[PDB]
């Protein structure tokens, strides 16, 4: 009754990995001496990678070894930690408090200054625009451009000196920049201004994604870039050709689902094997952002279709259909943040309608909108208690299949509906 397992002993230098086959149905205390001679004042034992050491009395059967798992060679757990004892209550405050990482140090000040700065820029911008939107005077556009230009330089100025402040200072640079261009030829907050801005951030972003020396700040750039580009076209074509009473979003939700359904390929579009780990995450970061572009777009017009009153009964089903489609399109996405993004599409959209009615003075659908959130929250909870309805393993295969034709049967089955709202084929 032998079983083939592989142990791992790494205490001396790097590590030594061999495998073997071992006689089951015994107290591990008998076979421990053998392995100690192959691979190699304390006592040792065997443990699965990720678990606690196995008792010296159980057998490799009753402790549940499958023939081919990778055991490690760890130590018997511990003894007591031998608690210290100090009687003078005075020194009982200085002694038992060191274990904090409390020292002020000239690095709590580094994080200090930058965090102060990012606040200065933000409210520095918002003041001038508030000096510009609720009243009118262009002195702001002097100050907007002043700070907007300044931060532009600083990120380019510490690209190779901090390597973390840099990428942080870039992401905040686009708040005043998007504010600056949005101020040329104002209008009433303007029709074509939103065209000028989508050029700006899409400009500023693309310059910096390639400007990042490493990870940690890539995904936020990628997502807003495609978001800028995406809104640019459907704003440009909206600036001259089409009057588009309501069909800006009909372009968006179309463009939205298009980006979400076609997501894996777009990530690949941005593309010794030693630098594989660096390449694999950036690839993942690219995907996780790109999907956010989808959801944020998916609502971007969807928040405008059912926005005002007097909407269409086909308009109400034009958004709901999209939501479910994206919600059931998650089961294909592996990572965690990838899942959450599309999963909470309905959540994000739910609140949008609420504020819309409260700011639109409706006090009718507002309450409903709040009742349309609980239903979505309630299902989240029952998904959390028992890992049963969340786990598709305790299902049926045609159920796993039916959800398929269910999925592709609706996420695309709205383009005929789309032709109704605008009435594209009523002409």
């Amino acid at each position: 009754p032998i079983v083939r397992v592989a142990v791992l002993a790494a205490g001396d230098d790097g590590g030594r990995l061999t495998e073997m086959a071992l006689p089951s149905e015994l107290p591990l205390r008998e076979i421990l001496p053998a392995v100690q001679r192959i691979v190699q004042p304390v006592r040792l034992s065997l443990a699965p990678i990720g678990g606690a050491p196995f008792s010296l009395d159980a057998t490799l059967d009753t402790v549940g070894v499958v023939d081919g798992d990778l055991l490690a060679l760890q130590a018997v757990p511990s003894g007591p930690p031998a608690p210290r004892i100090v009687e003078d209550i005075a020194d009982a405050a200085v002694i038992f408090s060191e274990a904090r990482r409390r020292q002020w140090g000239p690095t709590h000040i580094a994080r200090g200054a930058a965090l102060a700065l990012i606040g200065l820029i933000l409210v520095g911008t918002g003041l001038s625009v508030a000096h510009r939107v609720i009243t009118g005077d262009l002195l702001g556009q002097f100050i907007v451009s002043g700070i907007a230009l300044a931060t532009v330089i600083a990120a380019l100025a510490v690209r190779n000196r901090s390597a973390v402040l840099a990428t942080s200072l870039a992401v905040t640079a686009l708040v005043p920049v998007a504010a600056a261009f949005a101020l040329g030829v104002p209008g009433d907050f303007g029709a074509p201004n939103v065209l000028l801005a989508a050029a700006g951030v899409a400009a500023w972003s693309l310059i910096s994604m390639a400007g990042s020396p490493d990870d940690r700040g890539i995904a936020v750039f990628t997502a807003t870039a495609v978001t800028g580009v995406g809104v640019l076209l459907v704003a440009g074509a909206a600036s001259l050709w089409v009057i588009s009473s309501d069909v800006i979003g009909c372009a968006l939700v179309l463009l939205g689902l298009i980006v979400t359904v076609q997501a894996a390929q777009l990530s690949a579009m941005w593309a010794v094997l030693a630098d594989l780990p660096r390449r694999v995450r950036v690839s993942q970061a690219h995907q996780t952002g790109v999907i956010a572009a989808g959801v944020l777009l998916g609502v971007a017009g969807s928040v405008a279709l059912v926005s005002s009153a007097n909407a269409s009964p086909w308009a109400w089903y034009i958004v709901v259909a999209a939501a479910a489609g994206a919600a059931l399109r998650a089961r294909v996405w592996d990572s965690a943040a990838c899942k959450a993004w599309l999963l909470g599409h309905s959540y994000l959209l739910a609140v949008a309608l609420l504020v819309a009615f409260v700011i639109g003075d409706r006090y009718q659908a507002a309450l409903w909108a709040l009742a349309a959130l609980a239903v979505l929250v309630l299902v989240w909870i029952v998904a959390a208690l028992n890992p049963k309805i969340a786990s598709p393993d305790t299902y049926s295969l045609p159920m796993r299949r039916m959800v398929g034709f269910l999925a592709t049967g609706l996420d695309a089955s709205l383009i005929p509906v789309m032709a109704l709202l605008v009435g594209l084929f009523s002409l």
Binding site: P27, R29, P41, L56, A82, E87
Partner: protein
């Protein structure tokens, strides 16, 4: 059969400076601006704080030593094979001492308060802090300690079945591993020997006499009858000897009353007003996890040890190679 072993030099165990630290006495309350004594209280306590962190260092030495030479009854599996197995010789300060458990040791450092306690009126806050130092700190916390068998000459045991034995099965192992088996020889006599009980204590070249065959084992002193084991050591009556028994009844203390045989037996009854437990011939009831010496109830071990036969047998075999 048995491979050979050599006599190395025992690795020098971590030292133990057995100093006698001398604390300086406090002030005497003149009865003078308040800000004056406030300048001295802050001058004494600030002195005791540098001596409280100096006398706390000594402790971490003894607990480093005492633990260096009496590891828990699982480390002693890896002792025999390695190069430090029978390190102990007849002159170490730890010679013939048997780890029975772990509790509070009295910190052999002296802690003398060389002063003149005359017309007591000492500054209150600067005085109470002194006593507080002297009581809490003059005792190490949980430290492996145990029996000094070299001059004990009698053992008695009182407890239930699977526990009164496991204590002997516990420390007779630590008794022998820390010597070259040429120096100590045990003697066992048990009616229930070969049922997972003392039987495993056969394999050992500690369980050997000089020049016997007995068919399979070197000596195979492991038997049932007490007069059987006993006279198989009639010639052995300076190597040291541990005659032991598992019989609740049947006459202990029938050999002595020697110079190296400490006898042992298990019973079930405790005496009522036993006359003055000697520094020798102790009585050690074994509660759930304690080893309470009979006195008048003097725990004498705050958490005992128990050597299960499964990790026990595995001790013999490994020692049967050399």
């Amino acid at each position: 059969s048995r491979l050979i072993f050599e006599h190395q030099r025992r690795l020098t165990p971590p030292t133990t400076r057995k100093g006698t630290i001398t604390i300086e006495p406090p002030p005497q309350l003149p009865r003078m601006r308040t800000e004056e004594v406030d300048a001295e209280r802050a001058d004494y306590l600030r002195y005791l704080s540098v001596v409280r962190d100096n006398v706390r260092a000594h402790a971490a030495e003894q607990r480093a030593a005492l633990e260096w030479s009496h590891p828990e009854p699982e480390v002693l599996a890896t002792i025999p094979g390695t190069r430090r197995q029978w390190e102990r010789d007849p002159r170490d300060r730890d010679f013939l001492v048997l780890r029975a458990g772990r509790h509070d040791v009295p910190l052999d450092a002296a802690l003398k308060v060389k002063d003149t306690a005359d017309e007591i009126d000492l500054e209150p806050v600067a005085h109470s802090a002194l006593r507080g130092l002297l009581d809490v700190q003059r005792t190490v916390r949980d430290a492996p300690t145990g029996l000094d068998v070299a001059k004990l000459a009698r053992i008695t045991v009182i407890g239930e079945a699977d526990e009164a034995r496991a204590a002997i099965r516990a420390w007779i192992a630590q008794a022998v591993t820390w010597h070259d088996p040429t120096m100590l020889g045990v003697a066992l006599a048990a009616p229930d020997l070969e049922s997972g009980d003392w039987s495993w204590l056969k394999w050992l070249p500690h369980v050997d006499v000089p020049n016997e065959a007995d068919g399979v084992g070197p000596a195979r002193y492991l038997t049932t009858s007490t007069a059987e084991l006993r006279e198989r050591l009639a010639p052995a009556l300076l190597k040291h000897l541990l005659v032991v028994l598992d019989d609740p009844d049947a006459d202990p203390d029938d050999i002595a009353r020697l110079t190296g045989v400490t006898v042992i037996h298990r019973t079930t009854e405790l005496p009522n007003r036993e006359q003055y437990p000697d520094p020798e011939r102790p009585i050690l009831r074994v509660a759930d996890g304690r080893i309470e010496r009979w006195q008048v109830w003097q725990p004498c071990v705050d958490v005992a040890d128990a050597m299960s036969a499964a990790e026990a047998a595995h001790i013999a075999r490994r020692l049967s190679r050399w």
